[PDB]
C-alpha cells in the first residue's frame, strides 16, 4: 500500500497528458481526480498507522547510484513527519482538482492542465517519502519543473513566461546551495541516507554542521520564499488560481520548511544555523506583511500572506521547536488554500478582474464566498479558538518563552508583522465585500429591476456564485479551518506528546522552551496578539466607510506618498535584482561574446595570423622578380652570411635575432 | 465563445477542446490499466514493506490483511 500512494498520481498524469487525446477532457478529469482521491484515502490511513501506532515503514525498490561508498536507493521511508506532511498535500490537491473542474471548463487545453497538477502531486510525495537527500532532490526539482510548467500554462502571456523563468531560475539558485550542501554531506559522512546522517550527526565536527546547515538554509529560502529568495513567488501567481492554491499557497512553498524539519536531527547540533533560522524568519515575517497592505491585486496580496506565514514557520525552526512548525504548517495550509479558492470564485464572478479598485458590494451576490473567506481570515489573523489560533499564536509565546535577547526581539518583530497581518486581512474583506461597489453595472445589475426591454434574456450576468464543483472544496476546507486546529492540538503540540518518538523530529533538552511557553510567560503577552487583533482591525474599519479621509490625507503628503510607493513596489528589491544582478549577467555575456569571442580571441589568433601571414608572404613573393642578376646577388648574400656565421663563431642568438628581424622587417611594407 | 484553432495539429494531450465520442469505454479501458498495475505495485509493496515494531492485536490496523512481514508473525504468535 505504501508504495501505491507514490504510483497512482503518476499514473493519472501520463494518461491525462500522453493519452489525454484518448480519454477526453472529462475522462482526464475523472481519472486524475480519482487517482488523487484514492491516494488521499490511503494517505489518511497511513497517518492512522505510521503515527498513531508508531510504526515507520521502509521500502527499498532498487539502487539509484552505486559508486564506492555512495549507494543511493530509490527507497522510501514513512515516519511520523511524512504522514503529517502528506495530509495537507493530498487533501488540498484533491479539492483543487475538483475546484479546477469548475474553474477551467472554458480553457481549451484542460487535460494538459489536469496532468500537471497530478504530476505536481506525484513529486511532492517523492520529496517527503524519500530515504535520503538525493531522492528528495528529485521531488525538489520535480515540483520546480511542475511549477514552471504551470506558471507558464498560458504561454502566450509574456508575463507568464518571465514569471516562469523567475520561478525556475530562482529555485535553481537555491538548488545550487542545496546541491553543494549535499556534496558536503557526501564528503563528510560517505552517504546521505537519513538514518546515516542523523545517527552520526551528534559526533561530526561543529564546522561541518554549519557549512552543511547553511547550504540547506539557502535552499530553503528559494522554495519557501524568504527575505532574499522570494521574487519568484508573488509573480508566480500568473498561473491559474488552482495552481496557486495547491502549489503556491500550501505545498510547494513549504518544501524548504519540510527540509529544515526533516534535517532537525542534523541541524540541532549547531546553534548558528538555528540563530539565522530565527532572525531571517522574523525579517521575512515583517518584510512580507508590509508589502501586501499596498497591493491592488487579490491574488498578489494573498500571495504575500503565504510568505508571512512561511516566515513564522522558519522562526519556530530557529526556536528549536519543530513540532510547532509542523502543527502551524499543516494548519496554515488548510485555511490558506480556502483563502485563494475563495478569491478564485470571486475572480470567476467578475469578468476575471483582479483589482481592488473595481471591487465592492457582492455581499448579497456572493454570500457563501464571503462566509468562507471570513472563516479563513479569522484563522489567518489568529482569532482565538480557531484552526490558525493554536498554530499561529503559540509561536509568539514560544518565541517569548525562550527568555533570550533574540527571542524577545523577534516577538516585537512578529507582533508588528501580525498587526499588518490584520490590516490586509480586512482590506481584502472590506474592498471586495464590505464596501460600496466600485466596478461597472454588469457586476451587480440583477434581474429584480427590469431595466431592459428587448434584452431581458441576456446582459444580466450579475456575478453569481459557482456550481457544486467550485463550492464543495470551500465547504470542506471551511470545516477544517474552524475545528481542525483544536482536534489535533494534543496530536502535535500537546505538552509531553510522544507522537514523534521514532526520531522523526529531534529536539535537544538544552534549549527546551515548551514548559516556559505555558508557564513563565506573563498573561498579558499571551493574550497581547488578541488585543492587537481586535483593536487594530477597528481602526481600519474606522478609517474606511466611517471617515475615508485620513488615509487620503496621508497618501498625498510628500512623506506619505513615497511610503506608499516604496512598499507597493516591493521595497525596490526586484529593481535591485534586475538592474544589478540579471542585467549584469546579460552584459558580461555581451562583453565576452563581442569583445572577446568575436573579438580579440580571433584577432590574437586565427584572423590576426591570417591577415599578417598573408602580407608577410606577399612581401617575400615580391623578391621573386625572376631576374637572374638579382637572384645571383641573393645567392652571394647568403654565401656571405653563412661565412659570417661560421668563422666568426657568432653566438646562435644573433642568427635567430637576425632572422626574426628580417622576417619582421619583411612584415613591414615598402 | 470558442477560440478558433487549426484542425491539423495532432496533440498527444488532445488538442484544443478535445473529447472523443468514446471517452467512456476508453476511460474504462485505461482505468483497468491503472488498477491492474496498482495492485501489481500493491503486491510488491505488500511483499517488501519491512517493519520492526509489531502492532497490538486490538488496535485498528488495515495492513494486517495483505502485508507479509506481520501475517507470518501473527500466525507464528498463534502458537502456544
Amino acid at each position: 500500500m505504501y508504495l501505491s500512494i507514490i504510483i497512482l498520481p503518476l499514473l493519472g498524469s501520463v494518461v491525462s497528458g500522453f493519452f489525454g487525446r484518448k480519454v477526453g477532457v472529462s475522462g482526464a478529469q475523472l481519472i486524475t481526480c480519482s487517482s488523487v482521491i484514492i491516494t488521499t484515502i490511503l494517505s489518511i490511513i497511513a497517518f492512522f498507522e505510521v503515527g498513531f501506532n508508531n510504526i515507520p515503514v521502509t521500502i527499498n525498490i532498487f539502487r539509484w547510484i552505486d559508486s564506492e561508498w555512495f549507494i543511493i536507493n530509490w527507497g522510501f521511508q514513512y515516519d511520523s513527519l511524512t504522514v503529517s506532511m502528506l495530509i495537507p498535500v493530498l487533501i488540498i490537491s484533491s479539492l483543487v482538482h475538483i475546484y479546477s473542474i469548475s474553474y477551467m471548463s472554458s480553457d481549451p487545453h484542460n487535460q494538459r492542465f489536469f496532468s500537471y497538477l497530478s504530476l505536481f502531486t506525484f513529486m511532492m510525495i517523492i520529496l517527503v517519502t524519500a530515504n535520503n537527500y538525493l531522492l528528495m532532490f528529485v521531488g525538489w526539482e520535480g515540483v520546480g519543473v511542475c511549477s514552471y510548467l504551470l506558471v507558464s500554462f498560458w504561454f502566450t502571456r509574456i508575463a507568464a513566461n518571465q514569471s516562469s523563468i523567475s520561478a525556475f531560475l530562482t529555485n535553481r539558485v537555491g538548488d545550487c546551495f542545496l546541491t553543494v550542501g549535499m556534496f558536503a554531506i557526501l564528503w563528510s559522512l560517505g552517504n546521505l541516507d537519513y538514518a546515516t546522517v542523523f545517527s552520526l550527526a551528534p559526533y561530526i565536527n561543529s564546522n561541518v554542521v554549519i557549512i552543511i546547515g547553511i547550504c540547506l538554509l539557502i535552499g530553503a529560502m528559494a522554495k519557501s520564499s524568504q527575505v532574499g529568495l522570494h521574487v519568484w513567488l508573488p509573480m508566480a501567481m500568473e498561473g491559474p488560481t488552482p495552481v496557486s492554491a495547491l502549489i503556491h499557497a500550501a505545498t510547494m512553498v513549504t518544501a524548504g520548511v519540510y527540509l529544515l524539519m526533516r534535517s532537525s536531527p542534523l541541524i540541532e547540533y549547531s546553534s548558528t544555523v538555528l540563530l539565522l533560522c530565527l532572525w531571517l524568519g522574523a525579517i521575512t515575517t515583517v518584510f512580507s506583511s508590509l508589502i501586501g497592505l499596498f497591493q491592488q491585486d487579490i491574488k498578489k496580496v494573498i500571495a504575500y500572506s503565504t510568505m508571512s506565514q512561511l516566515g513564522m514557520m522558519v522562526l519556530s525552526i530557529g526556536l528549536s521547536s519543530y513540532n510547532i512548525a509542523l502543527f502551524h504548517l499543516v494548519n496554515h495550509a488548510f485555511y490558506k488554500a480556502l483563502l485563494f479558492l475563495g478569491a478564485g470564485s470571486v475572480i470567476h464572478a467578475v469578468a476575471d478582474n483582479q483589482d481592488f479598485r473595481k471591487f465592492g458590494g457582492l455581499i448579497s451576490y456572493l454570500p457563501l464566498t464571503y462566509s468562507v473567506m471570513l472563516i479563513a481570515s479569522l484563522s489567518l489573523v489568529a482569532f482565538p479558538f480557531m484552526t490558525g489560533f493554536y498554530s499561529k499564536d503559540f509561536i509568539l509565546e514560544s518565541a517569548y518563552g525562550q527568555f533570550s535577547f533574540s527571542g524577545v526581539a523577534v516577538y516585537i518583530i512578529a507582533t508588528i508583522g501580525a498587526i499588518f497581518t490584520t490590516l490586509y486581512s480586512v482590506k481584502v474583506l472590506y474592498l471586495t465585500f464590505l464596501s460600496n461597489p466600485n466596478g461597472p453595472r454588469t457586476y451587480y445589475r440583477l434581474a429584480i429591476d427590469n431595466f431592459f426591454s428587448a434584452q431581458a434574456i441576456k446582459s444580466y450576468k450579475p456575478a453569481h456564485e459557482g456550481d457544486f464543483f467550485l463550492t464543495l472544496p470551500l465547504v470542506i476546507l471551511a470545516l477544517f479551518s474552524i475545528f481542525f486546529g483544536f482536534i489535533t492540538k494534543d496530536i502535535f503540540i500537546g505538552l509531553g506528546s510522544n507522537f514523534f518518538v521514532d526520531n522523526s523530529l529531534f529536539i535537544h533538552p538544552i534549549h527546551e522552551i515548551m514548559i516556559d511557553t505555558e508557564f513563565a510567560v506573563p498573561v498579558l503577552f499571551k493574550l497581547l496578539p488578541f488585543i492587537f487583533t481586535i483593536s487594530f482591525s477597528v481602526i481600519a474599519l474606522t478609517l474606511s466607510e466611517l471617515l475615508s479621509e485620513l488615509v487620503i490625507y496621508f497618501k498625498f503628503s510628500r512623506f506619505g506618498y513615497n511610503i506608499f510607493g516604496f512598499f507597493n513596489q516591493r521595497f525596490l528589491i526586484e529593481f535591485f535584482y534586475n538592474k544589478y544582478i540579471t542585467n549584469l549577467i546579460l552584459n558580461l555575456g555581451g562583453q565576452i561574446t563581442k569583445i572577446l569571442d568575436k573579438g580579440s580571441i580571433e584577432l590574437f589568433g586565427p584572423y590576426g595570423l591570417e591577415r599578417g601571414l598573408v602580407k608577410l608572404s606577399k612581401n617575400i613573393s615580391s623578391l621573386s622578380t625572376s631576374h637572374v642578376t638579382t637572384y645571383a646577388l641573393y645567392i652571394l648574400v647568403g654565401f656571405i652570411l653563412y661565412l659570417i656565421y661560421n668563422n666568426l663563431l657568432l653566438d646562435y642568438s644573433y642568427l635567430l635575432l637576425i632572422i626574426i628581424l628580417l622576417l619582421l622587417l619583411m612584415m613591414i611594407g615598402e | 465563445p470558442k477560440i478558433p484553432y487549426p484542425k491539423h495539429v495532432w496533440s498527444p494531450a488532445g488538442g484544443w477542446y478535445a473529447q472523443p465520442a468514446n471517452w467512456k469505454q476508453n476511460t474504462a479501458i485505461f482505468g483497468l490499466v491503472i488498477f491492474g498495475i496498482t495492485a501489481m505495485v500493491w503486491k510488491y509493496s505488500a511483499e517488501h514493506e519491512v517493519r520492526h515494531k509489531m502492532p497490538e492485536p486490538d488496535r485498528f490496523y488495515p495492513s494486517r490483511y495483505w502485508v507479509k512481514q506481520i501475517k507470518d508473525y501473527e500466525r507464528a504468535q498463534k502458537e502456544k
Binding site: 487525446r21 477526453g24 477532457v25 472529462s26 | 470558442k2 484542425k7 491539423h8 488532445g14 488538442g15 484544443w16 477542446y17 478535445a18 473529447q19 472523443p20 465520442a21
Partner: peptide, 6 residues
Amino acid sequence: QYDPPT
C-alpha cells in the same frame, strides 16, 4: 461543448 479530437 467539447470538440471531437482531430
